[PDB]
Structures are given as structure tokens and as C-alpha cells.
């Protein structure tokens, strides 16, 4: 894990040329200071340990947050699983065409009471489910439905107060790869959405309160983190420029290469 | 989603418009269809007003006075992925935007459709 | 004696000959090659037509002129009308190969100007209306080179690609495509590019009609100068050889 | 059935212990020890060797 | 039960925390892994290719693809200045948005040497000598050549060998710098200057154009991950 | 690590002088009472582990606290990470020019309603959020910012009634120590402020409620607490002696050498 | 799961504590150690180095 | 006691768990093992025999 | 666990005729690709560990549920036991 | 008295402890490793074995 | 990996057990059994050597 | 492969690099070297300065019209306000040293001229 | 911080002082730039006002009628580092204290000027 030594040289005189060279080629030169100065020996001990692919990506990032409430129009929170609606991850994992992980989920619900007019307030402690459906299964249409009976899909039941829910999930694609990038079409005669597969398909997750609590109304907010592990990765690209606009395509306003400064000798930033 | 969301159609007074909304399935959308159009006129201050809906193995027409059997759908088979609409004998007191909202939990999509009706037949 | 500056690269039934040439990259290291059995999944014994298909295309020529912004070129989809690759891709659900691809422009010792030649994997482009996403006429080309813009494409309501070169049709900075495979055409030193591509993707097979998986592009970066008395018309020429080419599922010809 | 493994570490080993406990490697914590590196195949991806001290064309 | 005593930190949450937990897919087999061409195994793969530098990035030239061109051409004296600007390879709008310099945006510190080449893009009869120097700090920038000739540096002959490579070595009172702009690590200078003249013969452009590339050297790392000032948000995308 | 023992000697009469040296040669005499008087012998077991450098330094201080609340004007806190705020840590690493060591950060955070008129309050439970943020990282202008999210920014989430959250840093400068001293300027042409250099830089921490609450004020208070541990130190001086004034340097208002008595031969102080 | 008892002190903070704790920075690599003079392992070294008394600390 | 710490995931009831726990009924010695035909020890089994496909479903 | 692999084959010209058979007889028949076309030779790694009967069955599930409460009529809860 | 056995692992090995801590099997964790097949019994039930190259019935 | 050390004690051994638990060596407890001494650095620094029982001048 | 026309030479932080060159003219046969102690008369102790002195010094440039007679420049004198090696000229009595010179002129294909570059010891004029 | 952030600077009327507010930043100051000048005159008890403001890339006049045209910026590029004014055509009535605030989150710096105006142009 350890970055190269640098050797000591001496003055030199002599035909060979290691700083000229022909970048047209496709290659990068080699060359290290030894070749063009005098240079002392260095027992270099400095690691590159931090810049792994691993330790690169592998934190908690939140993804997406929701609310849902105890009484009213929206009873439970429902959502595509899915990177690419926050801007810090996906432009981490855009770095590399091809990517496989397996995923930590960790959940953060917290809740608010509501202004009302409701006098004697006494609620109790609540409790939330989160439930996963995976592609293809039922979903629910309300608060109170047999699909909550949970038989064969995943769910977590959690009490607030303790410590945050959380689970793995394994390499989930029909796929070798996740395919971070697809130049193409689903649908066999290119007249559909262009940019559409199903190598990314996750699922859906659903969040409800399990119990009302008290009389009150109270607002309720999930934030899911995701963090990669065992991660592999192929095909480096040129870090996203332009900001972000949609969460299902790649399309962009254009921008200057960098920023700007006065002139091609001025020593400072504008 | 729906195929192209953003788009501006012009035709002609007495001419009839084809509004496209062709849709497509991801497997996680697995609750039941909803299919709505609704308008929001250009001469008119009225906003949002449902012309046709489909909903539970039926449609349902007659919801704007104005469109009064001249808006149908174009598909013998709807729920295979086309969402399209008819209006029929256009007049200038249409011209608008137009918009498709399909519904299949947990998906959802919706598509804006500027229709612009001119006087004479003529694309300049 | 002997000269790194010349080469020869014989394919099928064709030759192509070169005397000003830097090297040749190889994709990431890798040599091209057939798939293997402990990497199969479709389980019919596939086709291997092997010098009917891996050979030399050449492609209709393009001018370089002193303000052209850069030409593009989907890879399948540039070949699919073209001898019996095409047909090959006509007939059959799945198909597996690289490439040889092989970039000419040549001019005098008086001309001046530089090219990036890069092959570029699952370049997916934008669409001028951010809500949109840009039509296949737009995107493929077919045999005929797709053009960059010089500033950008105006939003409408429309299915057009953001063509503008600084942004390589894909929101990211041009200088750093370099990533990629690639070489420069510099008109002082060189008259070629040669890369050869091994198939990349994330299956190990793919339908080749639904999804192109690479990209050639070709950009300016020096324009093309000269003085008056000198050449105006100047080409560029792309030939392309498939490699190690093999097809599975047959079936009725057709794409829908 | 421990493994036991170096901890990171200064310059100028000390080591730690783990067991798996359940029953699927997905469960397993990261893999942040892995520090391999091979980059020519992005730099120098040239077919014809090129040694540093030569001109690059003859 | 066996007697246990919770100390501080049980049930935090710590986002760079790594622990074991079940899984809600018990005994999932997971597609078998392909052999895919390009794999990376460390970020640093990516900082040692060489990717071109935006040095001409004045008023609207950033976009375009002039950013990238540096003028030269044949003058009427010589040793006059090509271009300048400082070691700041996260900082500087020269070098921020470079390979090296977006991977640069995700860290704190960074050690060890740059490598900048230079590729000549006039006509093959056009001939010309450049000086490219480093200066270390604690003087200010050089003003003429005859000051920047007292530091680090390579006269660069163009002829069919078209590129020429500048080493910009670890000269640094600490094992480290910093990505950020900061006094106590100032880094240097670097310019360029002619030699001597370009000449060229009539009927060939006296205006030429070179191009610049930068990588790390294999002595280069960084520290400390963080977020990059690069991407922001005002709401999750749809 | 035991202290020396006593050797018993008797009388003397010769030309030794162990007692007789000269101070002016830098050196410290290393006389013991032998030297001068008749002594037993001594067997001591009196051991020096209570002062060593890593028991004389670890133990947990406070070094700074401050409040935020879930309403109104000051929604977060937001502090620059250093030892120089509070008197009692300060002074104790001074005794040293250079150290390094590792810490570990405890924070105690606790939170009080506020007088009010708002009737019927029934207040959920809160959820806090820690963020640090290394040096040139980018920091949040307001409680709902993306910045939040967290994807490389190390983030603790903690809930009001369990154990107080804790993490470890390992020691972080770009120089091979700590400075405590600098006597020098980080401009070349010394016309800046004097004392101030980089090599302490640690980053900035900012807190914040991730829920509201319930309808009532509520102000909260968060308390950082440092401990070293794995600590070297280099270059013993003397310890302060007058207040400290600024953060910042190391500014003094002048004062007496010690306190006073009323004579030369007084056996009490005053 | 293993069945246990929590003690009494559980999740107190007790600030001459000395527990492990999860690192928030993991992998890090820190700056390799200098040899610098005047290393100090123990507090008594301070001690038995001389100093100056003020003996006569009488009023100015 | 043993100092130990919380990791997040602590009281969750994930439905997907495999965990032990006590038995509300110790000692209880079940009724023995029979012999009984046509045991099935995975659901492919029953997925490789026949059965017959309604093609023609069409109307009533 | 794992799933078989596929042997492959190339023409044939005889008297076996593997694709021929009865389904009176109650048998169903063993016939794999190869019998009745050209393959390729396939090193199959998949699986069959998720569709055990105990990892089909081994999932929490709610199988009931009912109220009482603090004061008044229904004051505790009463369920015989059942899947049902 | 600690048993290693083996996790769930993908193809192109890692192990995992357990120690019972109850009295009673039916306290013990699912059994989710066994992989045994057998499907002759509901394929192929037939007194005479059939050949599959030859005719069924001659 | 377990490490048994002596605990501190009275004079007129009693050990206990250690095992790391984190990847990283700034994630391990404090040392605090460290007794050595060096005070010949601070007191006697002087380049000739000075015998106690003689005159430091002559 | 080789060419004989390449060339670079490397003395302190200093590099020079060439692609049309000759060969290389060694003096009478001889490489510089330091005093040796059978040839010494000064009886201190030398300082060598080694990198700070032995390094490349690029001089004013001069213009070559179609009427140019020439250009001459003493060597010890030309170098002596110029950095450590003109410091060390000024505060010591006694020097001594060697020399690499390299003049640069390059021009087309089609410009034509011919220069005499020579070092000559002892030019009293 | 601000280099010197105490001073006291002495005038005569009709001259044209130079209030310095140079500023150096550390690299944790990644917020937006805010800068304000500020006033408590001598001679009144109006307290804390501001006089000149620079914010979101420019500048903003025209705070205090008193000094009206006569309060600006002496660099061309401020945010470099110097924050400094020029205070024009003095008189005894603006004698009193000046103040300057750097912002840029999370650093924050202030520096007090103590300006003394005389009847005579004599340092005495």
C-alpha cells in the first residue's frame, strides 16, 4: 500500500531523453523528478490506503426522506428505491461505467407534533413499520390493508426511542453488473424512452405508523441512508459537470469547462 | 414513463387533433390503471379541469361542456400502453395546454400538451 | 532496417498500410476474444462466421473544415447496414464482438491542427428539453457521421440531442475524456489512429439493435490552419473491423 | 472460529479480532484492507512497449 | 445472563461506522461475477492519466474549446512571458476541474509530485525553444526570464519528439498541503517563457498553439475524505 | 517505575564535596540526604505512575458549549474545533512545545422548554444531529440545507435519553506534531497577524434537532468533550502564569511573580 | 441472542473512563513520527529540574 | 460487568430474523418421526412435473 | 445445491428418438436442450438454496390480531390459536 | 463447544460461528442449509424404468 | 487474539484481558503503563561529564 | 531505437534538452574536475557549493541581422551578478571552475547561415 | 482574521482617510463573503449604523445620508483580502468610531477604528 521512494541522482550528459516523448500515442509518461534534476534519496512511508475504491464510497449517505401522518389525506409514505435523486451519491458512483456492492439500509424517523385545537393530550408511544416490496409484488392502497400482513415481504417493525432500524441487502440485479450508464432502448424498434432498463430494479419501500398514539396530529419524517459494501467497480469516467436536472436521465444545461480569471499570467482566482 | 412529456402540436380550425400519451410499465407498478386528461385554456381563466377519465374498467366522458362528444379515445385497448385522445372539429376557443396523468402505484406520470389552433390551414 | 513509424493490419480480405503512425492501443489490456463456457448463459451453439464479418468497413469520408466542432459514430448501429455484419445482426437476437477501428487524415508539412480520437463506452447523451429525451434520428447516425454544435442547442418542446463539443454531448468536461481509450491525430507528427476495443458491457451477450455499448468520437481541439496557396479540402476517414464476432437465437429477420 | 488481522497503524503489528455471526456474506462488514493497485492499463495502453530513456518515434 | 455494562456510544448512529448486520434476503444467490475489462481498485489509477488543462480560461473562452489552446507565436524580441499560474492543483480554476484536480475535491491533504506535459500543435516547419520553470515560494512569481531561470526548470527543443514533460517535485516544509487555499502551504509558481523565437518559413502560419496535460507522479497521495464543493441540491431530483 | 531507595551511610571526614558545586555550569546537582548527614537505610515502594505524561493528560474536559433551538432565529450550532476556548485543557497542554495524540470526543447534550403561551403541548421525542466537517469542506447556511445529507462528512444521530454519543479522531496534522507555539507569521513578508498557522487546523462541528418537537419552545445546549489519548510530548516549559485573554494568542495583562508575606523570615503567607 | 444483565453504571459518562470507540475517520493514514529532541515521558523530569525561588516576596 | 455497546439495529423485530429464543414449553419430548411417502425437500420438485396448460382461454 | 449444466452437442442422423414418448403413462419426460437442437457446453453456477421448503416457509407473518381495553366492556383479549 | 460452518457465498470459503444457549432444540435457529433433491418420486413413478432414447410403449 | 497484562497493584500478579475490537489503532485504549524515565536530558546537559564528589571548577 | 542527434544534460535544478544537435566538444581532452591535494597551495578548507553554483544560467538573448559582425562575452564576468555563483565571486579571494556552454539558434528549412562558436583562453584585446 | 483590529487614526479636515480592514481567511471558511462597514459618531448618539455594504458579488451605497458619495472601496478585487474605504472631505462632524465586519461562514472578524479629526493639519 505504500507510495514509491525516490532515488538520489546525479548531474548527467547523454543521449537519452526521458522527458521527450509523444503524447499522441495514447500514453503517459513516467517520469519521475530524478529524471530531470538532481534529487536527493527519500524513504517515503506515506500510504494511499484512504483512496481505495472501498474506503471511497463506503459511508452512510441519506437518499431520500418522506413524511406521513397519524390522521388526514396521507397515512403512509411510499417510494422507488432508487440513487439517483440525491445529488452527492450518484456522483460518486458515476465515477465508474459498471459497479457491484451489496448495500447497508439504515432509517432515521423522527416525529412532530402538529398545531391543533384538541385539548387533553395524552399520546402514547409509537410505533412504525417499513415494509419492501420487491418488483412485482402488491402494494398497499391504504393505511389498512392485508398486504401490511407482510407473509413473504421483509418489513421492520420499530418503537421510537431506540436505536435506528437497520439491514442488508445483497448484489440485487439480474445482471452481472449495475450499469450505471445505458446508451440504448428497452423497447426493440428505439421509439420509447431512451436511457430505460431494468438491471437497477430494487423495488419499494413503504412507511406507515403501526398505532395513532393520542388524539393529537402528528407528522412523522423517514430518512434512508444507504451505504455500499464489497464493492467492485469497472470503466472510470469523467466526473459529472454540469449539475444535475432529472432523476431518470442524464440531461444537463451547459456550463464552461472551469471558472474564470483575468488573464493567462494572473496568479489568482476571479 | 410516458414517452415524450414536453410537446406543442398546431393544427387547423375544423381539423381534428390526435393528443398522444403513450405509456410504459416498470414491474414495480402493480396497483390498478388511472387515466386522466385535463385543460387549462388559453382565452379561459379556468385551470385544471378534468375533460375524460378512465378508472376502473370504464371510462367516463362528459365532464366539460365545451368538448361535449368530441374527446374519445383512440385505443380499442387502453391499458397495453396507450393513453391517447381525439378532439374532433377544433375551434380557436381550445387552444391550450392539455395534460395526461397516468396512475399505477407506485408509479406515476404525467405529460404536457400545448395545442395551438390556427385560422387558415397552413404550417407557414 | 526497420521503423516503428510504419505499419500493416490485415483482417479477412483486406489490408490497411500506414507510414506515419505513433503505436496502437489495446482497449484496458485486453486483446479481444470469444466467450468462454464457465461465462455462457444462452445454451444454443452459437454462429462464427469469422471472415465473412471481421474485416475492414470503410465509412463515408467527412470534411474538416477550420470551424467543425467534432464528429460522433454509435458503433453497432454504424456497420448495421453493411455486408454481412448487418445481415448477421439482422437475423439474430444476440451478438458479442469488438473492434479494430483505424481514424486517416492526412495533409502536408504546411498544415497545422489536432484531433482526439476516443472510444468512448455507454455514451449516453442529453436531450435539449431537460423533461424530453432525444429520438433515435437524432442519436444514430447510421454510416453517416453525426455532427457536434459549436454553442448550445435552444430548448423548445423538442426531442433534439444537446449537441454543444464543450460538454461531449454528456454534461462532463471534454479535456478529461482521456480516461478513455484514445489517441490524438497531430497533423505535424502522425497521419493515423488505430485502438483496438474488446467488448465491454455488463451481460455477457446483448441484442445489438436495442443498445449501442460504444462510441467513436473525433474532436478538434487545434483547428485546422493553413495559408492561401495551400489544399482547402481536407477528409476524414474511418474504417472499422469487428472482431472475434458471434451471434446467437436465430430467428425471422427484423428490429421491433 | 476468530480471525485475527493487523490494525491500521503509524509509521515511524498491534492486532484486533472478529467473528462472522450470521449465516449470509452480504452480513459481514467492509472490506477496507484491500490495497492492490495496477494502473497500467490506464496509463500505458500501448501495444508496443515504450522504454522511458528512447524517443517514443523512430 | 452475563453481566454487561452499556458504555457511551450504544445505540448512536455513526455514518462511517462499520458493523455487522442481518440480512432481510436470507440465502439470495447473487448473479455470478464476469470478467469485465478496466477494473480500479484505488482512485489514484484514475490521477496518474493525464487529462488536458484549461490554462487560456479568460471571459468567455471557458466555453469553448479555446480554454484549452495556449497562444504562441513568432515576435519581434524574445524572452518575453507564455503563460503562469500557481501549484494549487484543487484550488485554481487552472486545475480544479482536471482528473487530478476533481479527485483532489474529495479530500484534505495531498502529497508528492505533478507531472505537466506539453504537446507543440504548429506546422511540422515551424521550429521554437521554451523554458518551463518551477519557482518555490517565498519570493513572489518571476517577472522576467532572467529571474525565473534561477529555479527549477527544462528548455524544451520542438522537433519530431512533439512533447516535452516538466516535473514539478515535492518541495514542501510539511509531509503534507492542503487541498483549500492556504499561506502556510503556498506551493509555488509555474510559467513559461520563450527561448528563443518561432521561426517558420513563408506560406506556413506564424501563430501556433500548445497544449498542457497533467498527472500525478507514483509518489503522490491524499488524506481525509470529503465532500466536494463541486455538486449541490436545492430538492431530490425527479 | 518505583522511586529510589535510601542507602544508609555514617560519618565522614575527608576531601569529598558532594554538597559544594557551582550553578552557573547548567547542571543540577544530584545530591541525596546521604550526602550531608547520617541516614538509615530505606526499602521504598512509593511508585511515579500517577505522573506520566498520558495519566497527567487523559482524562475528559469540556472545552466548549453552546445552544440552538427548534424555532425562531438560531436553528443550529456551528463551532471551530480547538483546545484554546477553555482555560483548564489549555493550560495543561502547554506545558509542552509539541505533542501528538489521538482524542475522543464525548458530547453531552440535554434540552429545556422555554416560557410560552401555547396551550396543549405534548412534545415528541427529539433527535440531534452532529455533522463535522473537515477544513475546505462546504457548511450549511441554514437548518434544511443539502448540505445535511452527509455523504462524506462524518454524522452522528443521537436520541434524547440514551447514552451519550462518543467517537475517536486519530491525530490529524500535516507537521509531524502539534504546534502549542509559533513564533513566526504564515505571510513571507511577516505584515499579517503573528502567531497563527495551520497546523492545528482540526475542522468545524455543527448540531442541530432533525425533528421539531411538538408545538412548545425548546432550547437545547451540546457540550464537547475532549480526551487524548496514545500522547508524546516534546520541549518541558514553564506554565503560565498569567490569565489568559484571547483564543487566539497569547496576549496578558503583566502580574506579580508569586503573592506576598510580610517579611523575609514570616512563617505564614498573606 | 446471548442472554444478558446490564449492570449498575450502565450508560453512565464517567470522564476518567477508558473505553474503545468506533474511529470516524477509518484508515487514515497519520503523519509518520520525527525524532525530535527533548521527548518527556514523566512529570518528576520536570520536577527535579531547578528553578528560581523568589525568597523574598515583600510587598512591590 | 462486561463493557459493551449498542449497535444501531438493537430492539428492531426484523420478519426476516434468525435468532434463538426461549421455549415457552421445557422438556416437552414430541410425538416421534413416521415414515410417511412423498416427502418434499424443495419447491423445484414440484415445478419439474407436468401439468396441463389452458391455451384456449378465451371468453366464457 | 447448484442447478446442472448444459452438455453440448452437434447434429444427429439415428433410430432415437428422445422426443417422442407417451404422457399416458403418468411419467413426465426428461428431455433437456440437447436432445433436440445443437448447444453449446454451459458451466451453470446458479442456484437452488431460496426455494428449500424451509427457506419458502421461514418468514414472520401475522396471523391475527385483535383490541381491549383500560376500561369498560372488552376488557382483555381472548384468540383461539390458529393458521387458519 | 462453537460450530463453524460456512456462509452463503456467491461464485466467480467464509465461515461463521454459533453457540446454542438453550435447553431445548426447538429454541435453536432455522435450519437453512439443507439442499438435498429428490424428485424421481413425483417424476418417473413408474414400475418399469423408462429409457429416454427409446420408444415409451413398443 | 486475547492480551493479558498485570493490573496495578500495592506493594507489601492479579492480571486481566484485553481484546481490540476496532480496525484502526487510534480506536484502542489509553496507555497508561508506561514508566520509563529520562531526566538526564533536563538535568546534566553539560558536555563534560561532572563526578559528584569532586569540585565542578578547578 | 537511437539517434545520435538527441541530447540532454542535467546539472543541479537545471535540465537541457536538444533534438538537433552534433556531438559534444570536451575541452583539450579533458573533464573538469576539483583541485587536487598534490597540486594545492591555498592551505584552507575549500567550500564546494555544488548545486546552489553547478547549474544551468540562461543569459540575454541577442538578434542575428543580415549585417551582424559577432558577439564575445568573458566568462567569470559574464556570470557575476547572477545568483549563489556571483555571491560566492564576491566574497571570496580565490575561485576556481569549469564550464558547460550551450548557444541556441534554431530557424527553418529555408533560412541559410553559418556561426562560429569557439572559447578561447587568455583573450587580451 | 483582520490584521490590526484596534487602532485610532488622526486627520485634518479636507483630507481624505484610509480606514484598513485587511483580512486573511482560513481554510475552513467556505461560506459566502459578507462585508459591512458600520458608524458611531462622536459628536451623536445615533449608534451602529451601516454606511457601506458588499454582498452576493456586489456592492451597496447610499446608508448614510451624511456621507453621501463620499465612502468607498479602494481596491479593484475585494475579495482578495481587502476590505479597506476611503472616507472623503472630512469634517469634525463625522469624528467617532468606524467599524468593519468580515462574514464567511463559519468565520467572523470585526476591527474597530477610533477616527479623530483636527481644526489645524498638525500631527503636533
Given at each position: 500500500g505504500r507510495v514509491a521512494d525516490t532515488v538520489g541522482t546525479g548531474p548527467t550528459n547523454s543521449?537519452?531523453?526521458?522527458?521527450?516523448?509523444?503524447?499522441?500515442?495514447?500514453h503517459t509518461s513516467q517520469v519521475v523528478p530524478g529524471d530531470t534534476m538532481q534529487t536527493r534519496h527519500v524513504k517515503n512511508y506515506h500510504?494511499?490506503?484512504?483512496?481505495?475504491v472501498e474506503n471511497f464510497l463506503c459511508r452512510s449517505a441519506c437518499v431520500y426522506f418522506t413524511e406521513y401522518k397519524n390522521?388526514?389525506?396521507?397515512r403512509y409514505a411510499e417510494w422507488v428505491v432508487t440513487?439517483?435523486?440525491?445529488?452527492q451519491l450518484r456522483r460518486k458512483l458515476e465515477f465508474f461505467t459498471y459497479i457491484r456492492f451489496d448495500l447497508e439500509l439504515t432509517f432515521v424517523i423522527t416525529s412532530t407534533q402538529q398545531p391543533s385545537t384538541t385539548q387533553n393530550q395524552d399520546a402514547q408511544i409509537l410505533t412504525h413499520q417499513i415494509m419492501y416490496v420487491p418488483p412485482g409484488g402488491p402494494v398497499p392502497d391504504?393505511?389498512?390493508?392485508?398486504?401490511?400482513?407482510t407473509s413473504t415481504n421483509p418489513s421492520v417493525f420499530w418503537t421510537e426511542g431506540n436505536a435506528p432500524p437497520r439491514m442488508s441487502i445483497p448484489?440485487?440485479?439480474?445482471?452481472n453488473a449495475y450499469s450505471?450508464?445505458?446508451?440504448?432502448?428497452?423497447?426493440f424498434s428505439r421509439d420509447?424512452?431512451?436511457?430505460?432498463?431494468?438491471?437497477?430494479?430494487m423495488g419499494t419501500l413503504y412507511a406507515r405508523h403501526?398505532?395513532?398514539?393520542?388524539?393529537g396530529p402528528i407528522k412523522s419524517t423517514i430518512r434512508i441512508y444507504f451505504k455500499p459494501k464489497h464493492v467492485k467497480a469497472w470503466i472510470p469516467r469523467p466526473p459529472r459537470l454540469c449539475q444535475y436536472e432529472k432523476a431518470k436521465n442524464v440531461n444537463f444545461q451547459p456550463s464552461g469547462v472551469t471558472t474564470t480569471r483575468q488573464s493567462i499570467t494572473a496568479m489568482t482566482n476571479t | 414513463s410516458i414517452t415524450t412529456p414536453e410537446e406543442m402540436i398546431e393544427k387547423a380550425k375544423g381539423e381534428t387533433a390526435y393528443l398522444p400519451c403513450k405509456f410504459t410499465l416498470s414491474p414495480e407498478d402493480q396497483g390498478p390503471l388511472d387515466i386522466e386528461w385535463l385543460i387549462s385554456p388559453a382565452?379561459?381563466?379556468?385551470?385544471?379541469?378534468?375533460?375524460i377519465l378512465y378508472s376502473g374498467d370504464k371510462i367516463y366522458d362528459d365532464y366539460y361542456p365545451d368538448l361535449k362528444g368530441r374527446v374519445h379515445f383512440?385505443?380499442?385497448?387502453?391499458?397495453?400502453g396507450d393513453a391517447s385522445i381525439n378532439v374532433t372539429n377544433?375551434?380557436?376557443?381550445?387552444?391550450g395546454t392539455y395534460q395526461c396523468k397516468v396512475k399505477k402505484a407506485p408509479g406515476v406520470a404525467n405529460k404536457k400538451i400545448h395545442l395551438v389552433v390556427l385560422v387558415k390551414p397552413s404550417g407557414a | 532496417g526497420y521503423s516503428d513509424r510504419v505499419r500493416s493490419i490485415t483482417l479477412g480480405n483486406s489490408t490497411i498500410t500506414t507510414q506515419e503512425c505513433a503505436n496502437v492501443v489495446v482497449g484496458y489490456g485486453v486483446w479481444p476474444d470469444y466467450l468462454k463456457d464457465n461465462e455462457a448463459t444462452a445454451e444454443d451453439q452459437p454462429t462464427q462466421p469469422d471472415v465473412a464479418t471481421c474485416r475492414f468497413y470503410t465509412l463515408d469520408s467527412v470534411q474538416w473544415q477550420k470551424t467543425s466542432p467534432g464528429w460522433w459514430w454509435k458503433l453497432p448501429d454504424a456497420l448495421s447496414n453493411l455486408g454481412l455484419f448487418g445481415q448477421n445482426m439482422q437475423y439474430h437476437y444476440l451478438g458479442r464482438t469488438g473492434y479494430t477501428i483505424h481514424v486517416q487524415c492526412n495533409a502536408s508539412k504546411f498544415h497545422q491542427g489536432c484531433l482526439l480520437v476516443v472510444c468512448v463506452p455507454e455514451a449516453e447523451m442529453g436531450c435539449a428539453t431537460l423533461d424530453n429525451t432525444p429520438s433515435s434520428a437524432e442519436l444514430l447516425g447510421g454510416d453517416a457521421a453525426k455532427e457536434f454544435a459549436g454553442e448550445p442547442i435552444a430548448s423548445g418542446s423538442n426531442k433534439l440531442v444537446?449537441?454543444?463539443?464543450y460538454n461531449a454531448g454528456?454534461?462532463?468536461?471534454?479535456?478529461?475524456?482521456?480516461?478513455f481509450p484514445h489517441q490524438w491525430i497531430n497533423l505535424r507528427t502522425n497521419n493515423s489512429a488505430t485502438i483496438v476495443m474488446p467488448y465491454t458491457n455488463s451481460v455477457p451477450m446483448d441484442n445489438m439493435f436495442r443498445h449501442n455499448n460504444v462510441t467513436l468520437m473525433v474532436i478538434p481541439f487545434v483547428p485546422l490552419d493553413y495559408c492561401p496557396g495551400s489544399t482547402t479540402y481536407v477528409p476524414i476517414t474511418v474504417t472499422i473491423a469487428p472482431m472475434n464476432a458471434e451471434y446467437n437465437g436465430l430467428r425471422l429477420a427484423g428490429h421491433q | 472460529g476468530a480471525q485475527v488481522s493487523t490494525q491500521k497503524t503509524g509509521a515511524h503489528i498491534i492486532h484486533y479480532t472478529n467473528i462472522n455471526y450470521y449465516?449470509?456474506?452480504?452480513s459481514n462488514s467492509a472490506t477496507?484492507?484491500?490495497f492492490a493497485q495496477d494502473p497500467g492499463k490506464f496509463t500505458e495502453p500501448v501495444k508496443d512497449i515504450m522504454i522511458k530513456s528512447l524517443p517514443a518515434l523512430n | 445472563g452475563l453481566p454487561t455494562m452499556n458504555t457511551p456510544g450504544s445505540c448512536q448512529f455513526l455514518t462511517s461506522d462499520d458493523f455487522q448486520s442481518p440480512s432481510a434476503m436470507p440465502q439470495y444467490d447473487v448473479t455470478p461475477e464476469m470478467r469485465i475489462?478496466?477494473?480500479?481498485?484505488?482512485?489514484m489509477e484514475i490521477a496518474e492519466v493525464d487529462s488536458v488543462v484549461?490554462?487560456?480560461?479568460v471571459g468567455e473562452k471557458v466555453?469553448?474549446?479555446?480554454?484549452?489552446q495556449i497562444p504562441v507565436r513568432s515576435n519581434?524580441?524574445?524572452?518575453?512571458?507564455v503563460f503562469g499560474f500557481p501549484?494549487?492543483?484543487?484550488?485554481s480554476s487552472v486545475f480544479s476541474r482536471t482528473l487530478l484536480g476533481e479527485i483532489l475535491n474529495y479530500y484534505t491533504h495531498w502529497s508528492g509530485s505533478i507531472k505537466l506535459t506539453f504537446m507543440f500543435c504548429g506546422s511540422a516547419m515551424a521550429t521554437g525553444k521554451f523554458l518551463l520553470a518551477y519557482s518555490p515560494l517565498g519570493?513572489?512569481?518571476?517577472?522576467k526570464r532572467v529571474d525565473a531561470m534561477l529555479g527549477t526548470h527544462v528548455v524544451w527543443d520542438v522537433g519530431l519528439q512533439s512533447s516535452c514533460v516538466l516535473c514539478i517535485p515535492?518541495?514542501?516544509?510539511?509531509?503534507y498541503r492542503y487541498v483549500a487555499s492556504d499561506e502556510c502551504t503556498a506551493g509555488g509558481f509555474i510559467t513559461c517563457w520563450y527561448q528563443t523565437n518561432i521561426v517558420v518559413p513563408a506560406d506556413a502560419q506564424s501563430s501556433c498553439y500548445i497544449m498542457c496535460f497533467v498527472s500525478a507522479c507514483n509518489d503522490f497521495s491524499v488524506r481525509l475524505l470529503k465532500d466536494t464543493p463541486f455538486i449541490s441540491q436545492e430538492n431530490f431530483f425527479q
Open positions: 543521449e537519452a531523453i526521458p522527458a521527450l516523448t509523444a503524447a499522441e500515442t495514447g500510504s494511499r490506503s484512504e483512496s481505495t390522521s388526514g389525506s396521507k440513487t439517483r435523486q440525491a445529488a391504504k393505511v389498512d390493508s392485508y398486504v401490511w400482513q448484489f440485487l440485479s439480474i445482471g450505471n450508464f445505458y446508451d440504448g432502448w428497452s423497447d420509447g424512452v431512451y436511457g430505460i432498463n431494468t438491471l437497477n430494479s403501526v398505532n395513532t398514539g393520542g388524539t | 382565452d379561459n381563466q379556468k385551470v385544471d379541469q378534468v375533460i383512440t385505443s380499442n385497448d387502453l391499458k397495453s377544433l375551434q380557436l376557443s381550445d387552444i | 444537446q449537441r454543444v463539443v454528456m454534461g462532463i468536461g471534454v479535456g478529461n475524456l482521456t480516461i | 449465516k449470509d456474506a452480504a477496507r484492507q484491500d | 475489462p478496466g477494473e480500479v481498485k484505488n482512485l484549461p490554462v487560456q480560461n466555453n469553448s474549446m479555446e480554454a484549452y519581434e524580441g524574445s524572452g518575453t512571458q501549484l494549487q492543483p484543487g484550488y519570493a513572489g512569481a518571476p517577472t515535492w518541495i514542501s516544509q510539511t509531509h
